[PDB]
């Protein structure tokens, strides 16, 4: 009965942790913010429609100059767009078209992608040859690639359906650190602003905070009732929201280790595909299966606005580093720029 | 206006032209999703239609370019990636007929045939596959003739009251699979009794795909 003694001891530890969280839940964020003014009229308009993809879009990523962005679609194309002019800068043909994620290196020198091929391919955008070349194929995951984020030009973090995350040395192509402990498909990860921590969301309805350099799980966050499809750090690195199939977004503070607020409406019953904060953190933008993006007041949980400009699932969105615009990508094959 | 952007706008249109020309090829492609429990005969079908996640193969027949995707080893939740295959032309579902009498494993819940039937129920009724034709290859018919001589079908179907002839058992199994389709009026299953030597199966998939093309053109032309 060793498995019995351990399974019962885990229940006592959970009760201790639950009690410790309750012990420091002296107030709620919602009652703290009653006094502050609402954000009011959020009237966002479509300023650009990026046309040219011919299949569902699943991912995009802004470059750090807030002007270039990359998008990945099942037509087997990785397109880099100049969002100011809408010019296509590059169209990269993928060896496998079953992509689920893409990423822009913070330097702008590289993009990455991958998917049901279980491979994260690294693409050099700045060759002497004049074209874009695959520089690395990161192999070793045993399930689909669900997310990836560069740390720098030589390190990248990946998430996989094999329930693990991994830190890769791009130069050598080797998995140097693994992140195990999730018990379901890992769907999303988010790098801390200082890149010392990242958070991941999995199909076990939990989020986990990981220490990049130590290679282990610092904290575990529960509360969602179903799949976590999306996750995003608060801009100061002290909190993160969690897009989930339960049509809810539960921002979790790291240091207080618990949920502060839920964002939901009785008439929203669809899954959430994507979340992102505005530059100041005041606005929480979320993409919904019902084809809309909802703009939430992150401090008061009221809906501030709606972006209704797509004819199919919004699969991805992102806010520029300067905060000037948000892009939404959709299964309808178009991207739109809003501000 | 457009001092050096003129050469940039020209480049955008020159690569926007190659996207259009590469999408015209893809729209003529017949996309096939191969499914089935392990050892159901899937890789044998691949060999028949011929001379790391999604194993892929392509082949030409009667001037049609087929693209077949074998999900293969994919240890993950189907519900999270299956919607990626929305829009495939046809599903090829392989079933090992001779698996009906396989003894349960140590902790196996159901026999091999019933797990295959469960997989078919989930696929046929999947919300992303409502308008997709299902082609069913009931495979390994040769082994079935040897097994059915000595092992009764009641091992697999305790309610079966027929005889242990090939004809009665094969017809009953086919009915049992096709009865799982809850949308028979909107979706049509194309059932073939292939084997290890059968060669008309590629023709069967070609004929089934041609009907699917007719439905799409009738849908597009407004007649449906």
């Amino acid at each position, epitope marked *: 009965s060793e498995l019995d003694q351990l399974r019962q001891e885990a229940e006592q530890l959970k009760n201790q942790i639950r009690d410790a969280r309750k012990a420091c839940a002296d107030a709620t964020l919602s009652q703290i913010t009653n006094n502050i003014d609402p954000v009011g009229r959020i009237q966002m308009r479509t300023r650009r429609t990026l046309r040219g993809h011919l299949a569902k879009i699943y991912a995009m990523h802004w470059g750090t100059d807030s*002007r270039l962005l990359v998008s990945a679609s099942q037509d087997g194309k990785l397109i880099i767009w100049d969002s100011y*002019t809408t010019n296509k*800068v590059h169209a990269i043909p993928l060896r496998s078209s079953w992509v689920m994620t893409c990423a822009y290196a913070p330097s702008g020198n590289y993009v990455a992608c991958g998917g049901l091929d279980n491979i994260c391919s690294i693409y050099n955008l700045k060759t002497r040859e004049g074209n874009v070349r695959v520089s690395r194929e990161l192999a070793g995951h045993t399930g689909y690639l669900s997310c990836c984020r560069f740390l720098d030009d030589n390190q990248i973090v990946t998430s996989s359906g094999d329930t693990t995350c991994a830190l890769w040395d791009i130069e050598t192509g080797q998995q140097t650190t693994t992140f195990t402990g999730h018990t379901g498909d890992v769907m999303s990860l988010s790098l801390a602003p200082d890149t010392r921590l990242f958070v991941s969301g999995a199909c076990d309805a939990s989020a986990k905070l990981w220490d990049v350099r130590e290679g282990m799980c610092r904290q575990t966050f529960t509360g969602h009732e179903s799949d976590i499809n999306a996750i995003c750090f608060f801009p100061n690195g002290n909190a993160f929201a969690t897009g989930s199939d339960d049509a809810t977004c539960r921002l979790f503070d790291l240091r207080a280790d618990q949920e502060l607020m839920t964002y939901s409406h009785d008439n929203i019953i669809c899954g959430i595909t994507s979340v992102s904060f505005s530059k100041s953190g005041r606005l929480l933008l979320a993409g919904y299966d019902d084809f809309n993006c909802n703009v939430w007041d992150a401090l008061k949980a009221d809906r501030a606005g709606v972006l209704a400009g797509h004819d199919n699932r919004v699969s991805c969105l992102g806010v520029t580093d300067d905060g000037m615009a948000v892009a939404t990508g959709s299964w309808d094959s178009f991207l739109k720029i809003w501000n | 206006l457009s*001092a050096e952007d003129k050469a940039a706008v020209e*480049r955008s249109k020159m690569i926007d032209r190659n996207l259009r020309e590469d999408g015209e090829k893809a729209a003529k492609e017949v996309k096939l999703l191969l499914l089935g429990a392990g050892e159901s005969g899937k890789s044998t079908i691949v060999k028949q239609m011929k001379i790391t996640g999604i194993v892929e193969t392509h082949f030409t027949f009667k001037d049609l370019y087929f693209k077949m995707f074998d999900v293969g080893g994919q240890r993950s939740e189907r519900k999270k990636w299956i919607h990626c295959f929305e829009g495939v032309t046809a599903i090829i579902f392989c079933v090992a007929l001779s698996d009906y009498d396989l003894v349960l494993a140590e902790d196996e819940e159901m026999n091999r045939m019933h797990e295959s039937m469960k997989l078919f129920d989930s696929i046929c009724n999947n919300k992303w596959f409502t308008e997709t034709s299902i082609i069913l290859f009931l495979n390994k018919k040769d082994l079935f003739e040897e097994k059915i001589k000595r092992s009764p079908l009641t091992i697999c179907y305790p309610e079966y009251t027929g005889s242990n002839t090939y004809e009665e058992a094969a017809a009953y199994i086919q009915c049992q699979f096709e009865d799982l389709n809850r949308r028979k009026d909107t979706k049509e299953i194309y059932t073939h009794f292939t084997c290890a030597t059968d060669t008309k199966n590629v023709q069967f998939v070609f004929d089934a795909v041609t009907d699917v093309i007719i439905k799409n053109n009738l849908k597009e032309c407004g007649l449906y």
Partner: single-chain antibody
Amino acid sequence: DVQLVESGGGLVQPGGSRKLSCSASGFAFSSFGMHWVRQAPEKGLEWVAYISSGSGTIYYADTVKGRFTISRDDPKNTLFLQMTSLRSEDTAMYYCVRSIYYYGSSPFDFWGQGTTLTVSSGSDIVMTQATSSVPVTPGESVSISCRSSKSLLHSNGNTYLYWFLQRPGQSPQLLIYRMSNLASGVPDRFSGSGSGTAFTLTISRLEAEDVGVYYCMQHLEYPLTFGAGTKLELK
């Protein structure tokens, strides 16, 4: 390894015809807007013709339109210049130049080796390098100047000024694109600045190999035009 090898030069009688070729290897020729630039024996650089990627756009210099035809054969990675009615004023070294144009690109980033041609016996922006030569000593710091008759700053925010270095006996090499951007592979001791009409190239701790002729060039509008060049002499 990027290579551009021109051929077809030689001695020709006036009024005759001659076809130059430029053979490309080591890069994606097709996707590169080619440029023919020529240099008279003891003179500066003069732009001759341009053919875009895809051949959709062709520009000629005024002094050559009607007489010269530029073409490319993409499958064989070759550039052509068909010349006719050759005059004595066409005697020059002819450089083949690659130039790719997209957001953040570096045009004019590789020049051919050049081929020698010998012929027997207004609205354009003027580029001015008022200083024809400068004596320098290693380790010192130099500032070369250039001015434009029109503002090179565009409403998009870019200022379309390029700096090239021609070492003695070699093809020109890009140093600075769009006035302030440092070209790839060029040491960080070079830097460019200016505003609108007047511009400055500054070298810090000048070394031995730095000696040569420095040309400025405008890419605001066609025809592209160079400065007369500023020479750096050793003391």
